[PDB]
Subunit: 181 residues, 8 copies
Amino acid sequence: AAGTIIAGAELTIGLLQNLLDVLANVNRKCAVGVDNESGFRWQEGSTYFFSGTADENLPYSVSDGYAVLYGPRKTNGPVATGVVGVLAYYIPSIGKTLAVMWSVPFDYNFYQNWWNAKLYSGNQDADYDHYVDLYYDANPFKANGWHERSLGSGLKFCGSMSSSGQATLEIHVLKESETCM
Amino acid sequence: AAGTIIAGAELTIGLLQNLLDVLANVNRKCAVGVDNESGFRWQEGSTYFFSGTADENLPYSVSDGYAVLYGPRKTNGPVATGVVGVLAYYIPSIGKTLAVMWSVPFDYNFYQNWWNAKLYSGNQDADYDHYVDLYYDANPFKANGWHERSLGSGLKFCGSMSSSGQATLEIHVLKESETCM
Amino acid sequence: AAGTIIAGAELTIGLLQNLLDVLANVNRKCAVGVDNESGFRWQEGSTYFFSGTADENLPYSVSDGYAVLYGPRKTNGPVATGVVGVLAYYIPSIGKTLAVMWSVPFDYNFYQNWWNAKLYSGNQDADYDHYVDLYYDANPFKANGWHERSLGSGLKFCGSMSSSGQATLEIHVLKESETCM
Amino acid sequence: AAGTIIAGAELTIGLLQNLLDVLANVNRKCAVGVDNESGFRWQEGSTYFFSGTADENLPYSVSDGYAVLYGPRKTNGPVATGVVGVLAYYIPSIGKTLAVMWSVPFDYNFYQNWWNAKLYSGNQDADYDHYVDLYYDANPFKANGWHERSLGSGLKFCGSMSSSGQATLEIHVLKESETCM
Amino acid sequence: AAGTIIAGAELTIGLLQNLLDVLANVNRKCAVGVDNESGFRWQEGSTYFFSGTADENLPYSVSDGYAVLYGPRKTNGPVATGVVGVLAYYIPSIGKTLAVMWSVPFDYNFYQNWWNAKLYSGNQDADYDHYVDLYYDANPFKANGWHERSLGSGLKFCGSMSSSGQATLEIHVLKESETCM
Amino acid sequence: AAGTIIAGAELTIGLLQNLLDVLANVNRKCAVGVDNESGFRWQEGSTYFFSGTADENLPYSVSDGYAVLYGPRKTNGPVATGVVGVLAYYIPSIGKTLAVMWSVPFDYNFYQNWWNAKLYSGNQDADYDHYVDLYYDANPFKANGWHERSLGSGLKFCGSMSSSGQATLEIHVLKESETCM
Amino acid sequence: AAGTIIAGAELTIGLLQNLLDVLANVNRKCAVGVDNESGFRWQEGSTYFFSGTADENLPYSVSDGYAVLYGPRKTNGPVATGVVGVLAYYIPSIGKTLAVMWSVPFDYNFYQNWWNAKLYSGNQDADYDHYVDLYYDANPFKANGWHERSLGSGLKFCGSMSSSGQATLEIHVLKESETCM
Amino acid sequence: AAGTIIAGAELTIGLLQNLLDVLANVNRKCAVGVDNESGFRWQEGSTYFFSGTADENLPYSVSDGYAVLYGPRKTNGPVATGVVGVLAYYIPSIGKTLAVMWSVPFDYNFYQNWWNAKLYSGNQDADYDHYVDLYYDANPFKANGWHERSLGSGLKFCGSMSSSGQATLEIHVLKESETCM
């Protein structure tokens, strides 16, 4: 009895160490770049994560001709969740708030990389009601190259996301008349 | 008997080594940046930690247009506490003391990152009565992006904290009429 | 019984660790360089992968005299698939879309490196109907040095792929009258 | 008998190796900076350690407007003592000797970081009668931020120590009329 | 029985790991340098491998006074084959194609390093009929220092290969009247 | 019997490896700096070690305004002796020889760091009769900060040693009227 | 029986791994430098190895005032042979060929480092008939410092080899009237 | 029987590995610097080793005002011999040969570092009759600092050796009237 209980424990602890060493080294990140060619100041940068986190802050504002660079990532240690979230700014020159969403999941058998962006009315913090509205109810974009979309109020965007899981998301927000990039 | 006592000890010492090696490598830090655009000299920098420590000192004073950069961290070795504390300066041009608070907990199942700041009357060192007043009794701010708040005596702040656990806290303290960042 | 069950498990876990450590360290990548000497702007860069991924995005456009550099790779971790895909751009000055295809397989007993390129009518995203048309129905090129081919509408290309599996693909797209490289 | 004596020895030697490997890697240091804005030359630098050591010497003198930087540390190898000591200089322009004291203990369940400084009459080497007079009988300062204190003979200091255990101690010694830092 | 079956398996897996770790770390490469002093443009660079591969492409053309540098190597992983191949260019100013061949074998008990070069009629891709004609039917050169040979049509070459197995092959192709190097 | 003889040998060899690995990694060195502000040339540099060695030589002479830097260390490998020695120079302008002594012991339970210096009559090599005269019969100096001492013939020194065991010894030899450092 | 067959195999495989790991890490190389101060062009550089190889080629020619630097080494992997060889150049201004020989053996119980050089009549590749004539029949030079020797036709050399086994061979070939180095 | 034969073999192979790993990592070297301030050219540099070797050659000549730097070392691998040898140059302006000797032994229980130098009549290679004449019959110098000695023919030397075992030997050879260093 007891000799094989300790030997079966030493085997089981070896398997649990392999499981947690795998889940701690399966990495997800979404290097978000949002470029403001709008002709308008963006301010009051707010953030929500359905899963994952980031180590730096958003810029408080991004002025005309500058970019938000943001580096969100999965929760540290042996946890099987991806990086999924929303980023938002008020745009006081038009009275609307931009929100940008990304999903970079853990389990690519069930899910895939998605992103979206929209303008909401007034000043709003990013929260779960923006995540579900940007991910389900307004048609999101796959990680299959460049897409282009009007925002109303005289703005549009063009953007893309890579399919990697160590993803890049890249968006240019523009006057509607402007040629992308 | 004795062969399985020594083998069960060797297993138990293996488990206690894994527990303490995990608790020694679960890291918490809060890189605090406080920027003084107040028009007023801040002096007599004092500190309290509910948990954690830092290796450098506060500047004795931060003059108009300069910043306090401070790097507090958890207690070293296998201990399951986060970094939580208060930082304070007297502002003799108004007769009040600024205090700034952060919490960056160990256990994100129970807690989350929080911060706050306020002006108290007269000259005071930071201590536990500032920690409970900034964390419970005056409404603190989450790690969900940029927030803005008046201090009275003609000052305000805007600031944010990241949700990481290897956090950044970032505050600009300003004349109340001034545009943030 | 039980002593050899745990010893046969420890052997079997050793073999499964070797299998997954091999499949995680058998690397496939296809460093794609496509050089636009067409005299025409290429735009709306879209991508499909039959297998593998990339971490960066395509440029939204490649102007006259510049190149797309793209670094696709196999799916991360212990999976036995190569990198195979399609890249496409609209060329509005001629009303056609360029598509470029590569295959860099896992199993060189069954497969070999192949590539192709063609112009399709109108504006199209890259998808599986371009992969099968570029890989089966239009004659692809082996990894055996430089090949040259007319595209119609006054364009041609010359290009090559290396046979390595850590491949390079290299294409120059040119006016039909022009000398390659 | 003898098989479990050798196996219980191999376990006990494993535990004693862990104990001494911990005590050899629990580090204490106190990076002392003392800045001489006194208007007076300090000379004949002498040192005492209640526990710990340093590898460099004190400067023989620190002239007006220069600083003593000193890096004391715990005794090397597996020993459970902190760094605790006294540093002293004669100041012949006033006929008194400055002494500075720090404590950076091993066991933060019983102790905490403390420092102090005072002027004694005449010329004296630092020794145990300065350690007990600076640590018990003259009120020492905690590691809780900046403190300020008159020395008599027209001098004062302001200073602070960090609570880390890899501490910094930082003191400016000044004319009594002068603004600190 | 079963205890020595698992112990004999653990031994046999140890031997197969040593065999495959040896065959994966027995390296063969042939750094080919071919220098074009012909007075003639070479173009349409084509390649064949009897064994091994390369990661870069040939230049599409090598103009007068420039060199092809090419770095072929053995197939990656535990396979017991060397690097052996052919490289060819059309030379339209004379209506002939240069081909260059190297062999850098795995098993130096049976084989040795060899190279050759010749001009064929018209425009041809390198293939197995050039490998057998350059390695068997036209007299190849050993790795024993510098050799010199006329090509007809007013060209010659001089060249050498090192015997290492991490070989260099070095050829200068020249007008027949010219002094080598 | 024999199974526990080999197991008790494997334990005993493990203990002797730990003992010799400790004694080989308990380091003693005494970085000696002697600065010649004497106004006199020192020459014929000679050395004695009671224990330890050095890898470089003394300068043959140190002229006015230059320093001897010397880096003596313990005997290499698992030996439990410190670094202890004497350094001497003839000073022909006064007809005397300077000798300098240090001790940096292995066992700080029995011993502590000591140094001394003196002028002897005529020209002498350093040897054991200088070691005992500088360490016992002329009062040596502890590692407790700066000390100052007349030499006769119009010279003095001031100097200090650190208590570390990776020590520094630092001496300035001066005209008797001169202010130290 | 079978338990000690597998344990005696595991011991024997441990011994064969030590033998082959030693023979693979016992290194022999002979960094050959031959400096041409002859007043004459040397050309058609040819090489023979009795044992060992090199990775680079000889220069095709060495002109007046330049040097051949060549780095021959033993055969890679667990083989017990040194580096031994011949290097030769035609010298068309005198109608003779220089040959240079070195031996850098594996087994210094039987052998030692030797070198030689001579001029032969006409144009010849280096081969085994030069190795035996330079090593046995013309008196070779030991690795014991500088030696000097006439070549006839108005040339001489001076040279030396180091005894290391990671040897350097160094020869200056000169007009007979010239002073060496 | 057989189980303890294989276990006693595995112990004995462990001890022989420790012995040879120690003897292969007990290092002896003697960095020889000989500086020629003689006013005379030294030439035809020859060498003998009683034990050890070097990887570089002597300079063929050292002219007036230059130095021989030479780095002899023990025989590589697990052998218990030091570095011991002789270096010699002819000095044709006086018709004599300088020889320099060093000993840097393995076993400092029996031996110590020694050196010597002398002028012999005529031109001679260094050999064993110089080693015994410089080490026994002409009084050698210890590694105890600087020594000075006339050579006859109007020369002298001054020099020293360090006692380390990773020794430096340093000699200046001078006109007899000259002040050393």
